[PDB]
Structures are given as structure tokens and as C-alpha cells.
Write a protein that binds this ligand. Structure first.
Ligand SMILES: NC(=O)c1ccc[n+]([C@@H]2O[C@H](COP(=O)([O-])OP(=O)(O)OC[C@H]3O[C@@H](n4cnc5c(N)ncnc54)[C@H](OP(=O)(O)O)[C@@H]3O)[C@@H](O)[C@H]2O)c1
Ligand SMILES: Nc1ncnc2c1ncn2[C@@H]1O[C@H](COP(=O)(O)OP(=O)(O)O)[C@@H](O)[C@H]1OP(=O)(O)O
Ligand SMILES: O=C(NO)[C@H](O)[C@H](O)COP(=O)(O)O
Ligand SMILES: [Cl-]
Ligand SMILES: [Cl-]
Lengths: 469, 469
């Protein structure tokens, strides 16, 4: 009926896949659509009859509708369902065809699928797609990985549909590297999102608990903060949330929302542990959510555990600014950690990850978009082999000038009893990373004492075991 | 040569010493190692003992009285898998195979199921106390079928350490399949946490108070007489005595500050992340080791990243005492975290772990032997479903009284620029745990704003979504 007439194909007509399909169609292409449950594909075709969509009832019809090399994008449920869908397609595809998985996929799955499909002569592009439903429709940040020759054939469409960066119109997509490099970068992006959210949460909690500020007051502070170097979409979201009234009562909706946070957030931290990378801030943020889910225990504990009962006496304006600095500083700690993880992963899996570009493509179509991403890109433009962001001139100056405030904020908060797990982690990482010598000599001694694990010395090469008895 | 009542495979530090422990209880012990020269060394150095030198597995298996009792202390992972694979075909129905290495519990769980109907009884056990523990009395944490346990319980009790308090052996049934190796994994997690807390304390005494190793040794010596009385503090004061064996000065000052690890701490943090358990103190200590391995980077950073240079001008005796309190306070938080994880693990894997007994068997032959273990046991006798140690009167009281000192120590450390990731994690955990309300309400608002993830309300049951537009 429409044999080899479609330029691009999408499997999965839930909102994301539908939205992507429409994004692609809007760019001047005929797009074949498929969904396991056909009624859903019917609904899409019926309400978009004016578009160049090709309605397909079966995988055979779907595959047959596409020009070769076939470019097919999976937007189906992650895990077993994506493997089922891949397995369903394999027999119909020709050698040289290109499958693309745009689901939030754990990267080792992508690495396996890519390898297995390559034995069948099928290219596999594991692609991270940020921005949610609106992003899929209008412009996502995309992080593709897989065979470079295949990706070069998909690139034009991705660059056309991707979010364009507001500062220079550059598409928020680029080739990340082989096999699972694409979904790896997306994972780190999701970790980073968790960390940015927890840091804003602490900033909010300090302003509320210690300085006693109202929601309107805190809204104003975030607004003012967002006009400076902190400029970020998450802060914009935050000051918007603080405006809104309760839809089923009096006051503000944010004060009615139960503090039990909602999975896959653990992935970045899991890889960090596996790779030997210190990723304390994002991992503390994950654990911040976990402990909020222990609400019932905290209610009990709030009634028996003691803590300080202070009324703040200092200068409110001075401390608000000290908190502002602590936020930017700590956010910088988290990104340094996250890009150091990316560096290790790149060595481990041999991906030559393009670090400056990753920051560039996060400038739009994703929740972590912020202006200071440009400073990250500046840093790797200057030196692609930069081991850690903290060593670049810009970030050296920031930390030199902001660390004092961080410290005052930590003393203030800890003395008052306000929990600040990420802020405290930030300054602990700064003071660890810059320590020429750490007390790990003592740990090594202990391990040798009880376990005979051996150690290295400071004055000569070799492996040594002391006789402690 | 069927003289042998017990058999040990692996003649590195742990297996050699376990063999000698068992032989000293009045048994003849078969010994085997893959490199034969090691087995030769221990045979020749102990001709007075009743050991059977074997050079093949066929010989080793042949030398044991049926039903055979064979214990492996082999390098974890692939080596252990292969050793067992080689050994299984030689074994007879009724024989008992014990894996006493630090095996990742999923491997043991898999092994148990595979061996279920083989007629070969299987036990995966944790072993504590290091080389001297193995020689004189280890704490042991075995899991498997209860029937298998009961066949090795008698000899386990004989070799086990005996608690000084009541003479009770430091071994007990932990539960089904991988329960034992899981409990040992948490043990090591708790241990990483205390080791890092001790290291931080050392760092504070050395860098802020400016104290010599003699002065610091004396301090830890006094602490060990009080409520801090523990294995790790005991050996810490021993390490700080010893002088360099290949030069002048103290050995601890000649050991390179690159902390090694063999995966048990990492595994604990990974299980916490999978299970939804907040485990910041222990995880921060794993990351503290990871950052110690980034020595080259830290040397580079220390020349570029600036920080405070304050001179402690206060009362040293008073600050030392605050550090003590803080250390005991934080030690407790590590344990409270560990047991909270054991509770969640027990539920997930249907193990019904005996929390109170675990504490009992850690009273000797145990790297994490501490004075307050009975208070842990008391707390669980009182309430079997106790959710967290911090809810028990005993620990409520300690935290009430020492909490102020933790805050002064954190504040002093942070103003001085000395990294204290585990101390800051401790008070952050405490302050989060006792918080009835945390700022996860803002996180949920944000998530519902950008992804429509839904939220619970503070005032009514049900799932809600807000129309943010
Ligand atoms: N050391 C401690 O403080 C301590 C405490 C508690 C538990 N553990 C656990 O107990 C077990 C043994 O510990 P350990 O410290 O005595 O020594 P280890 O270094 O972990 O293991 C060495 C033993 O494993 C064998 N082995 C190593 N690689 C092998 C391979 N690729 N294939 C076959 N066999 C191999 C060695 O034989 P060869 O001599 O021929 O190389 C040797 O007998 C480990 O699982 C460890 O985690 C250790
Ligand atoms: N086992 C499976 N095999 C093939 N496709 C599947 C699948 N499970 C889910 N999907 C597809 O995966 C899509 C939904 O995945 P998802 O969990 O990411 O959804 P959403 O993002 O809407 O929550 C749907 O198109 C679904 O097809 P149906 O519309 O027929 O349900
Ligand atoms: O189980 C043990 N002692 O508890 C072993 O010595 C173990 O190897 C110690 O952990 P680590 O070697 O990862 O530091
Ligand atoms: Cl590839
Ligand atoms: Cl996003």
C-alpha cells in the first residue's frame, strides 16, 4: 500500500513515541507509525490525517513501508519489552538497517543489544532523549551512541528535531560514541538532575527553617538568584511552584505535598561505585530521597530524638547571599564529580566522550539546562584532557571566592540542626580533592594489621607487608 | 588417607590460620592450595601438628573421613567458582562444602539453589577477625539449609571466638542460602565507616591540634578504656606505636595514602541503593577510599585550590573530648545504618535475620567488636521489630548528650578546611532522621511540574496531580 515510501519509522504510540513521530513529520518527512495495540495507532492517524504519517497494522507492513537503509526508532517500555520488540523486528530487517532505542535504557542493556545486533548485521543506536513529552514533540536533548556510519545517516533528522540552544541555535544533539556511550551520558544527566534538585531543596529548607522566610519571600530570592550566574530552568520551576495556591484547600500547594520522594535514580551512583569514582553529592541526593520515603519512622523520631532550638539573630540579607554562593559552589562540586565519572567511563569502555559538547547539548530540551553549562564547555575547549573541572581557571576562581561562605553556611546549619547532606558533602569533597595527603595511610595500616592486605610506601616503589606482631 | 576430620582449601593467611585453629581443637586437618609450595611451607613449619599434606584435589578429597567437611578460603569470585567446580565431581552424597571467603551474596544464593538436590550440603559463611581471628577464634556468620548448618555447628562453635561476657560462641545460624555472606558484607560496610571516622579523627588531631603520633597514640589508648572500647580503636593505638622497618620514623607515616578495597564495602552500598535504604555514612567511606586512589590528581589540585589556614587557639583537652563524643556518636550512626539495611534485606529475601544474635556474635573474633553491642542486643530483645537503633532509649540518650559536641567538631573541622565526609554525614543523617518534615515536598512539586509524576498530600489519602498551567 505504501511500500518504501516512509523516510523514518517509530514503534510505540504512547505519548512520547507519538510526539517524536509528529516532531519528525513536522520537519518534512513521511513517517511510518506502529504500536503493538493497534487501536492507539488508529487514534494517532485519525487525529493527524493531514500529516504525512503512514498507518501500519503489523511489523511486516511497518518494515515494508520504510526506505532502506531502514531507520527505525523504538519508543517502547524499557527492559524486557524493548528486547521483545527488537526480537520481533530482527527477522524482517535487512543487513545495514538501523534500530534506535530512545527509551530510558540502562546502558549495559544497550551495550549487549548493540553487540548482538551487529552479529546480525543490524546497526543499533542507543539514544538518550530528555525533555519529556513536550520535549519529544517540540525539541529534545538527545544523546545517541552506536555505529558512527549508521548515526551519520540518522544525524540530519536528529539535528532537525532536537531542541535548539537559545544562545546560538545549535542543535542539542551530537554523537557520543560507540555502543552504550549515548545512554551512559543520559544516565549521568539524570544523576545530575537529582543533585541539582536536592541542593535547591536544602537552599529552600535553610531559608524556611533558619531565616523563617515565607513562600513569597523565597520565591523572590530564587527569582533574583536566577538573573545571575545560577540562571537555570530548575530555579525557574522552583519559583513558579512557590507561587501556586492549594487547589483543594487554603494556602500553597507546596505545603500540602507529602514529603515522600519517588526507581532508576540509583544508576549513576551504581556505576560510580563500580568504576571506583567518588560521586558523593549525587549519591547523597539519592539517599535524601530514600530517607524521605521513611516518613513513618521520621515522625516517630521527631518525637523522641533531641536537637537544638535556635532563633537566628544575624543579618538575613548577608546569609541569603552566603547560601546563594554555597548553592553555586556545591552545584559546581557535583558537575565536577559527574564529569570525572564520565571521564573514567570513557577510559573504561573506550568511548572518547566529547565533554565540552555534552555540556553544549544540555543547554536546551532538558531539565538541567543552565547558563553556566557554557563554562564547562569553555573548560574542555581549552583542554580536552582536563581531568577535573575544579582545575580550570574559572572554577578555581569561583571556589576561591565562595568557599568561605560555604563554610559559614555549614556551621550555621549544623549548629541550628537543619540537615544539609549535599552542602556538607560538597565542602568535604573540595577539602578532600585538594588534600595532597589524606589519612588513608592509617586505613592501609589497619588493613595490613588485621588482613595482611599489603601497602605501598611513600619513599620507594614496591609492595610491602609489616610484621605487626 | 581417610584419617582427616576436616579439610581446608586455600593456604594464604586465612586458610592457613583456620587450619591451625581446627587442628588445635584436637582434629587431623587436610590442607590444600593451588600453588603447592605454599602448602609445603605450612606443613614443614608445623610438623608437630596433625596436618595432612595433599598436592591434588583428588588426594585432598581422598584424605577426608566421610561425610567430608571441606572449607574454602579462596579469593572471591572466579577463583572460588572454579575451585568449587573442580571439587563438586569428587564429592559424595552427604559431604559438606563450606565457602568461608567474602563471596558476593548473589553468587552464594545461586549456588545454594544449584546444589539443592545434589546430596551435597552447602554453607556460605562469613568469617571475621582477620588472621589472628582465624587462628584463635573468628566470629562466623553462616547461612544455608538449617540441616547443613546443624552438621557443622559443633565444630564451628569449637573454633569460634567466645564472647568474654558469657563464653558464648560467636557463631549462629543467620538464615537461608546467602544470608550469612550478606551479614558479613554489612559487617564490612559498618567497618569501612568506622575506619573512615577513626581516620578523620586522626586527621583532626594531627592537622588542627598539631599532635604527635605519640600524643595521638596516648589519646586513642585512653578512649579505648571508655565507651569507645573497640577492636578498631585498639589496633589504631597499636599501629601508632610502631616504627619504620625500612628507615627512620613511624611506619604509619611511610604508608602511601591510597586506600585499597576488595569489594565488600562497595557491595553494601550497591545493595542499599537497590533496596531503597539510606546508607550515606558507609557509602561516603567507600568514596573516601576511591578519592584516596586519585593521588596524582590530589597532588595537582593541592597546588591550585586554595583554602583556610587557621591556627587552632582554643583548649586542646576540651576539643579532644568533643572529638571523642562525636566519634562515638558517629560510630553509632554507622551501626544504625547497617542494621536498618539488614532489616530491609531480611524482608526482601525472606531471611528473618536474628538482629540481636548478630550483635551477640560480633562481641569477639570480630573487627567490629564494640562495647555497645549488648545494648544493640538489649534493644532487639525489647522490640524484635525495632525499626532503627536510634529509637531505643539507650541510643536516644547518647545522641541527646553528644549531639552538641558533634556540631562543634563539624563546625571546627569545616572552618579549618579538614575533610570530614563521614562526621558531616553522621549529623546530616541524625538531623534528617529526626525531621518530621523534609524538603522532599519541593522535590515532589518539581517532579509533578515537569513530568506530571503525581504526589501524595499531607491532609488526605490518595494520589494527586496539579494543573500547573
Ligand atoms: N585476609 C582477610 O583479612 C580476610 C578476612 C576474612 C575473609 N577473607 C576472605 O577469605 C578468602 C581468602 O582470603 P585470604 O586473605 O586468605 O587470601 P586471598 O588473597 O583472597 O586468596 C588467595 C587464595 O586463593 C587462591 N587463588 C587466587 N587466585 C586464584 C585463581 N585465579 N584460581 C584458583 N585459585 C586462586 C590462592 O591460591 P595460590 O596461593 O596458588 O595463589 C590462595 O590460596 C577471600 O575470599 C577473602 O575475601 C579474608
Ligand atoms: N511487552 C511489550 N511488547 C511490545 N511493546 C510493549 C510491550 N510493553 C509495552 N510496550 C509498548 O511500550 C509503550 C509504553 O511504554 P512506557 O512504559 O515507556 O509508557 P509510558 O512512557 O507511556 O509510561 C507502549 O506503546 C506499549 O505498547 P501498547 O500501547 O501496546 O501497550
Ligand atoms: O573481611 C575482611 N575483614 O573484615 C577482609 O579483611 C576484607 O578484605 C576487608 O575489606 P577490604 O579488604 O575491602 O578493606
Ligand atoms: Cl557501536
Ligand atoms: Cl529532562
Amino acid at each position: 500500500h505504501h511500500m518504501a515510501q516512509a523516510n523514518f519509522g517509530v514503534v510505540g504510540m504512547a505519548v512520547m513515541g507519538k510526539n517524536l513521530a509528529l516532531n519528525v513529520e513536522s520537519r518534512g518527512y513521511t513517517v511510518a507509525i506502529y504500536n503493538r495495540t493497534t487501536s492507539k495507532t488508529e487514534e494517532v492517524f485519525k487525529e493527524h490525517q493531514d500529516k504525512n504519517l503512514v498507518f501500519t497494522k503489523t511489523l511486516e507492513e511497518f518494515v515494508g513501508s520504510l526506505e532502506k537503509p531502514r531507520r527505525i526508532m523504538l519508543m517502547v517500555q524499557a527492559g524486557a519489552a524493548t528486547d521483545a520488540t527488537i526480537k520481533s523486528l530482527l527477522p524482517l530487517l535487512d543487513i545495514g538497517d538501523i534500530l534506535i532505542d530512545g527509551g530510558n535504557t540502562h546502558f549495559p542493556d544497550t551495550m549487549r543489544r548493540n553487540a548482538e545486533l551487529a552479529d546480525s548485521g543490524i546497526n543499533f543506536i542507543g539514544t538518550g532523549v530528555s525533555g519529556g513529552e513536550k520535549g519529544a514533540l517540540l525539541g529534545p536533548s538527545m544523546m545517541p551512541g552506536g555505529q558512527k556510519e549508521a548515526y551519520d545517516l540518522v544525524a540530519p533528522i536528529f539535528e532537525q528535531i532536537a531542541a535548539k540552544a537559545p544562545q546560538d541555535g545549535k542543535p542539542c544533539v551530537a554523537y557520543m560514541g560507540a555502543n552504550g556511550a549515548g545512554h551512559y551520558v543520559k544516565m549521568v544527566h539524570n544523576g545530575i538532575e537529582y543533585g541539582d534538585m536536592q541542593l535547591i531543596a536544602e537552599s529552600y529548607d535553610l531559608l524556611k527553617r533558619i531565616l523563617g522566610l515565607s513562600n513569597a519571600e523565597i520565591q523572590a530570592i530564587f527569582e533574583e538568584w536566577n538573573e545571575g550566574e545560577l540562571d537555570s530552568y530548575l530555579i525557574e520551576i522552583t519559583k513558579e511552584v512557590l507561587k501556586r495556591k492549594d487547589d483543594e484547600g487554603e494556602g500553597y500547594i507546596v505545603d500540602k505535598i507529602l514529603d515522600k520522594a519517588g526507581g532508576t535514580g540509583k544508576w549513576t551512583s551504581e556505576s560510580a561505585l563500580d568504576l571506583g569514582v567518588p560521586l558523593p553529592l549525587i549519591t547523597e541526593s539519592v539517599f535524601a530521597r530514600y530517607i524521605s520515603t521513611y516518613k513513618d519512622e521520621r515522625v516517630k523520631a521527631s518525637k523522641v530524638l533531641s536537637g537544638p532550638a535556635l532563633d537566628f539573630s544575624g543579618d538575613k540579607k548577608e546569609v541569603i547571599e552566603k547560601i546563594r554562593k554555597a548553592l553555586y559552589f556545591s552545584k559546581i562540586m557535583s558537575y565536577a564529580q559527574g564529569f570525572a565519572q564520565l571521564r573514567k567511563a570513557s577510559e573504561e569502555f573506550d568511548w572518547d566522550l566529547p565533554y565540552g559538547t555534552i555540556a553544549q547539548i544540555w543547554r536546551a530540551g532538558c531539565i538541567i539546562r543552565a547558563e553556566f553549562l557554557q563554562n564547562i564547555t569553555d573548560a574542555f575547549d581549552k583542554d580536552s584532557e582536563l581531568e577535573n573541572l575544579l582545575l580550570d581557571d574559572y572554577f578555581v576562581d569561583i571556589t576561591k571566592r565562595y568557599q568561605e561562605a560555604v563554610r559559614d553556611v555549614v556551621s550555621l546549619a549544623v549548629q541550628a540542626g537543619t540537615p544539609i547532606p549535599t552542602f556538607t558533602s560538597a565542602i568535604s569533597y573540595y577539602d578532600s580533592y585538594r588534600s595532597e595527603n589524606l589519612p588513608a595511610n592509617l586505613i592501609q595500616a589497619q588493613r595490613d594489621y588485621f588482613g595482611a592486605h599489603t601497602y605501598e610506601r611513600t619513599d620507594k616503589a614496591g609492595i610491602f607487608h609489616y610484621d605487626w606482631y
